[PDB]
Amino acid sequence: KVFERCELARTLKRLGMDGYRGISLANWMCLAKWESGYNTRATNYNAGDRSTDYGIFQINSRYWCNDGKTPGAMNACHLSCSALLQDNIADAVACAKRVVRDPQGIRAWVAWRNRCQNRDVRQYVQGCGV
């Protein structure tokens, strides 16, 4: 599923992402935008280290979900990476919260640092009723 902007904003809010561990909804929107273009079926194989990024948040198989083909990988969200490719983003949201409970917080995603950090992300939630 390719979410429309405000549709995702409200979907993320209902799932409890607004202010989760101090991260505003706008930051999460900026993250999903740059990571997948709000596409839950998005995938990117990393030939360099044999890992794959899954879903709307492009969560990596090396540490967060199990796909059975990433060497010495971990599964911190304790989910099949397939759960990160559903139209329903509940599981991807549970896993994204898990990622941010770690020291780095939202900085876990390099794209967030590149395209969201210290930037005016207001535009991502404007007019969405959140």
PDB file of C-alpha atoms in Angstrom:
ATOM      1  CA  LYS A   1       0.000   0.000   0.000  1.00  0.00           C
ATOM      2  CA  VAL A   2       1.182   3.529  -0.801  1.00  0.00           C
ATOM      3  CA  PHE A   3      -0.291   5.758   1.883  1.00  0.00           C
ATOM      4  CA  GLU A   4      -1.405   9.267   1.153  1.00  0.00           C
ATOM      5  CA  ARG A   5       0.285  11.839   3.432  1.00  0.00           C
ATOM      6  CA  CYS A   6      -2.487  12.807   5.878  1.00  0.00           C
ATOM      7  CA  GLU A   7      -3.881   9.238   5.832  1.00  0.00           C
ATOM      8  CA  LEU A   8      -0.554   8.034   7.177  1.00  0.00           C
ATOM      9  CA  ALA A   9      -0.333  10.915   9.710  1.00  0.00           C
ATOM     10  CA  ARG A  10      -3.623   9.895  11.302  1.00  0.00           C
ATOM     11  CA  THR A  11      -2.807   6.172  11.025  1.00  0.00           C
ATOM     12  CA  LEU A  12       0.478   6.748  12.893  1.00  0.00           C
ATOM     13  CA  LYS A  13      -1.261   8.879  15.522  1.00  0.00           C
ATOM     14  CA  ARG A  14      -3.875   6.197  16.195  1.00  0.00           C
ATOM     15  CA  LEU A  15      -1.038   3.716  16.664  1.00  0.00           C
ATOM     16  CA  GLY A  16       0.511   5.915  19.353  1.00  0.00           C
ATOM     17  CA  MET A  17       3.503   7.343  17.481  1.00  0.00           C
ATOM     18  CA  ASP A  18       2.896  10.995  18.301  1.00  0.00           C
ATOM     19  CA  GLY A  19       5.601  11.893  20.785  1.00  0.00           C
ATOM     20  CA  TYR A  20       6.641   8.274  21.312  1.00  0.00           C
ATOM     21  CA  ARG A  21       9.995   8.542  23.151  1.00  0.00           C
ATOM     22  CA  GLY A  22       9.957  12.271  22.403  1.00  0.00           C
ATOM     23  CA  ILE A  23       9.644  11.831  18.615  1.00  0.00           C
ATOM     24  CA  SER A  24       6.952  13.997  16.983  1.00  0.00           C
ATOM     25  CA  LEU A  25       4.566  12.669  14.352  1.00  0.00           C
ATOM     26  CA  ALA A  26       6.189  15.048  11.823  1.00  0.00           C
ATOM     27  CA  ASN A  27       9.577  13.382  12.309  1.00  0.00           C
ATOM     28  CA  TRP A  28       8.054   9.941  11.735  1.00  0.00           C
ATOM     29  CA  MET A  29       6.335  11.253   8.601  1.00  0.00           C
ATOM     30  CA  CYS A  30       9.601  12.708   7.361  1.00  0.00           C
ATOM     31  CA  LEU A  31      11.188   9.282   8.000  1.00  0.00           C
ATOM     32  CA  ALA A  32       8.564   7.212   6.115  1.00  0.00           C
ATOM     33  CA  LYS A  33       8.582   9.767   3.290  1.00  0.00           C
ATOM     34  CA  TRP A  34      12.296   9.518   2.616  1.00  0.00           C
ATOM     35  CA  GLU A  35      12.639   5.839   3.476  1.00  0.00           C
ATOM     36  CA  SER A  36       9.902   4.453   1.194  1.00  0.00           C
ATOM     37  CA  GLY A  37       7.668   7.234  -0.134  1.00  0.00           C
ATOM     38  CA  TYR A  38       4.978   5.897   2.244  1.00  0.00           C
ATOM     39  CA  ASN A  39       5.115   2.478   0.536  1.00  0.00           C
ATOM     40  CA  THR A  40       4.674  -0.556   2.814  1.00  0.00           C
ATOM     41  CA  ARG A  41       5.846  -2.987   0.106  1.00  0.00           C
ATOM     42  CA  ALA A  42       9.159  -1.152  -0.326  1.00  0.00           C
ATOM     43  CA  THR A  43      12.315  -3.292  -0.217  1.00  0.00           C
ATOM     44  CA  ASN A  44      16.002  -2.695  -0.773  1.00  0.00           C
ATOM     45  CA  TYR A  45      18.613  -5.418  -0.880  1.00  0.00           C
ATOM     46  CA  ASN A  46      22.046  -4.473   0.400  1.00  0.00           C
ATOM     47  CA  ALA A  47      24.386  -6.638  -1.673  1.00  0.00           C
ATOM     48  CA  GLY A  48      27.341  -5.420   0.340  1.00  0.00           C
ATOM     49  CA  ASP A  49      26.321  -7.159   3.547  1.00  0.00           C
ATOM     50  CA  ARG A  50      23.492  -9.464   2.451  1.00  0.00           C
ATOM     51  CA  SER A  51      20.756  -7.680   4.408  1.00  0.00           C
ATOM     52  CA  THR A  52      17.419  -6.290   3.179  1.00  0.00           C
ATOM     53  CA  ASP A  53      15.403  -3.247   4.280  1.00  0.00           C
ATOM     54  CA  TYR A  54      11.664  -3.838   4.639  1.00  0.00           C
ATOM     55  CA  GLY A  55       8.510  -1.772   4.399  1.00  0.00           C
ATOM     56  CA  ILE A  56       7.433   1.771   5.053  1.00  0.00           C
ATOM     57  CA  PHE A  57      10.297   2.397   7.508  1.00  0.00           C
ATOM     58  CA  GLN A  58      12.867   0.282   5.634  1.00  0.00           C
ATOM     59  CA  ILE A  59      13.769  -1.670   8.758  1.00  0.00           C
ATOM     60  CA  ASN A  60      16.894  -3.831   8.287  1.00  0.00           C
ATOM     61  CA  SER A  61      16.969  -7.635   8.584  1.00  0.00           C
ATOM     62  CA  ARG A  62      20.449  -7.693  10.115  1.00  0.00           C
ATOM     63  CA  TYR A  63      19.039  -6.680  13.491  1.00  0.00           C
ATOM     64  CA  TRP A  64      15.251  -6.196  13.530  1.00  0.00           C
ATOM     65  CA  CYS A  65      13.337  -8.888  11.706  1.00  0.00           C
ATOM     66  CA  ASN A  66      14.038 -12.413  10.516  1.00  0.00           C
ATOM     67  CA  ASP A  67      14.044 -13.310   6.812  1.00  0.00           C
ATOM     68  CA  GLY A  68      16.191 -16.411   7.256  1.00  0.00           C
ATOM     69  CA  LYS A  69      18.792 -15.316   4.689  1.00  0.00           C
ATOM     70  CA  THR A  70      20.835 -12.622   6.443  1.00  0.00           C
ATOM     71  CA  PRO A  71      24.067 -13.997   7.942  1.00  0.00           C
ATOM     72  CA  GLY A  72      24.400 -13.975  11.731  1.00  0.00           C
ATOM     73  CA  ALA A  73      21.400 -11.662  11.803  1.00  0.00           C
ATOM     74  CA  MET A  74      19.243 -10.877  14.768  1.00  0.00           C
ATOM     75  CA  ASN A  75      15.502 -10.386  15.191  1.00  0.00           C
ATOM     76  CA  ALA A  76      15.058  -7.702  17.887  1.00  0.00           C
ATOM     77  CA  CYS A  77      11.435  -7.003  16.939  1.00  0.00           C
ATOM     78  CA  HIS A  78      10.801 -10.766  16.970  1.00  0.00           C
ATOM     79  CA  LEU A  79       8.874 -10.669  13.693  1.00  0.00           C
ATOM     80  CA  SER A  80       9.194 -12.244  10.257  1.00  0.00           C
ATOM     81  CA  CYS A  81      10.335  -9.528   7.836  1.00  0.00           C
ATOM     82  CA  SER A  82       7.154 -10.467   5.949  1.00  0.00           C
ATOM     83  CA  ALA A  83       5.220  -8.706   8.776  1.00  0.00           C
ATOM     84  CA  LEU A  84       6.898  -5.491   7.621  1.00  0.00           C
ATOM     85  CA  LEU A  85       5.362  -5.785   4.127  1.00  0.00           C
ATOM     86  CA  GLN A  86       1.672  -5.742   5.190  1.00  0.00           C
ATOM     87  CA  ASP A  87      -0.803  -2.996   4.207  1.00  0.00           C
ATOM     88  CA  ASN A  88      -1.607  -2.812   7.920  1.00  0.00           C
ATOM     89  CA  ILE A  89       1.308  -1.037   9.553  1.00  0.00           C
ATOM     90  CA  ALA A  90       0.639  -2.054  13.156  1.00  0.00           C
ATOM     91  CA  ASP A  91       3.589  -4.485  13.243  1.00  0.00           C
ATOM     92  CA  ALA A  92       5.938  -2.094  11.431  1.00  0.00           C
ATOM     93  CA  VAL A  93       4.989   0.542  14.016  1.00  0.00           C
ATOM     94  CA  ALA A  94       5.625  -1.858  16.923  1.00  0.00           C
ATOM     95  CA  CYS A  95       9.040  -2.582  15.426  1.00  0.00           C
ATOM     96  CA  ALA A  96       9.862   1.104  14.741  1.00  0.00           C
ATOM     97  CA  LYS A  97       9.106   1.856  18.445  1.00  0.00           C
ATOM     98  CA  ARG A  98      11.463  -0.999  19.349  1.00  0.00           C
ATOM     99  CA  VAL A  99      14.193   0.542  17.183  1.00  0.00           C
ATOM    100  CA  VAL A 100      13.855   3.877  18.971  1.00  0.00           C
ATOM    101  CA  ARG A 101      13.902   2.411  22.474  1.00  0.00           C
ATOM    102  CA  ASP A 102      17.630   2.028  21.770  1.00  0.00           C
ATOM    103  CA  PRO A 103      20.242   4.765  22.575  1.00  0.00           C
ATOM    104  CA  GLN A 104      20.286   6.374  19.112  1.00  0.00           C
ATOM    105  CA  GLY A 105      16.549   6.938  19.096  1.00  0.00           C
ATOM    106  CA  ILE A 106      15.241   8.176  15.720  1.00  0.00           C
ATOM    107  CA  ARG A 107      18.865   8.721  14.651  1.00  0.00           C
ATOM    108  CA  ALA A 108      18.976   4.947  14.024  1.00  0.00           C
ATOM    109  CA  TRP A 109      17.927   5.741  10.455  1.00  0.00           C
ATOM    110  CA  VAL A 110      20.646   7.568   8.537  1.00  0.00           C
ATOM    111  CA  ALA A 111      18.080   9.002   6.085  1.00  0.00           C
ATOM    112  CA  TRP A 112      16.449  10.705   9.092  1.00  0.00           C
ATOM    113  CA  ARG A 113      19.753  12.445   9.886  1.00  0.00           C
ATOM    114  CA  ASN A 114      20.226  13.331   6.222  1.00  0.00           C
ATOM    115  CA  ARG A 115      16.742  14.637   5.463  1.00  0.00           C
ATOM    116  CA  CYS A 116      14.882  15.374   8.674  1.00  0.00           C
ATOM    117  CA  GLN A 117      17.307  16.322  11.430  1.00  0.00           C
ATOM    118  CA  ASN A 118      17.444  20.071  12.116  1.00  0.00           C
ATOM    119  CA  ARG A 119      14.970  20.666   9.320  1.00  0.00           C
ATOM    120  CA  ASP A 120      11.493  22.234   9.141  1.00  0.00           C
ATOM    121  CA  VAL A 121       9.372  19.055   9.109  1.00  0.00           C
ATOM    122  CA  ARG A 122       6.112  20.899   9.884  1.00  0.00           C
ATOM    123  CA  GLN A 123       4.958  20.499   6.281  1.00  0.00           C
ATOM    124  CA  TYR A 124       4.542  16.743   6.736  1.00  0.00           C
ATOM    125  CA  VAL A 125       1.571  17.010   9.098  1.00  0.00           C
ATOM    126  CA  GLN A 126       0.060  20.323   8.005  1.00  0.00           C
ATOM    127  CA  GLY A 127      -3.649  20.095   7.268  1.00  0.00           C
ATOM    128  CA  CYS A 128      -3.867  16.450   8.431  1.00  0.00           C
ATOM    129  CA  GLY A 129      -5.844  17.100  11.630  1.00  0.00           C
ATOM    130  CA  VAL A 130      -3.234  15.647  13.945  1.00  0.00           C
TER     131      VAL A 130
END
